[PDB]
Ligand binder design. Sequence first.
Ligand SMILES: Nc1nc2c(ncn2[C@@H]2O[C@@H]3COP(=O)(O)O[C@H]3[C@H]2O)c(=O)[nH]1
Length: 142
Amino acid sequence: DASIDYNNKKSIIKKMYIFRYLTDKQCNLLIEAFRTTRYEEGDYIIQEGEVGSRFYIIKNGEVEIVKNKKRLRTLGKNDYFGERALLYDEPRTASVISKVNNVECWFVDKSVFLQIIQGPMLAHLEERIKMQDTKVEMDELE
Ligand SMILES: Nc1nc2c(ncn2[C@@H]2O[C@@H]3COP(=O)(O)O[C@H]3[C@H]2O)c(=O)[nH]1
């Protein structure tokens, strides 16, 4: 029963692109720590400017990223968000809005997030942030 849920969560995580660098211990912590929630269409999962404590992974549906009234992108299944506030100890840099009903996210707190990214995952997260900031900066020149 608990073994079933462990089995299922391990099976899914082992398949996921973003978690491909997890050590066995990091994977164990993630399986034990994550929780899930469902959002309705239009729900603000994250609001820009607020303190954040959670890292999110989309398991169903799509979300919109909006910053200063500008749409930045749409994220989908097996994408993550909410990493910037936790990495840099800063308020949320953008809002994240559920685009449809029944969007489901997994999430872990900051302590778990910091522990499970150690290794190659950290460097990949920071690289993506750099590229994102670069394109947004150039996009805004128009
Ligand atoms: N500032 C910013 N955040 C983004 C972008 N794309 C998706 N996001 C996510 O939106 C989130 C806002 O909360 P965080 O700042 O903690 O982390 C952010 C990211 O994970 C982007 O191009 N710029």
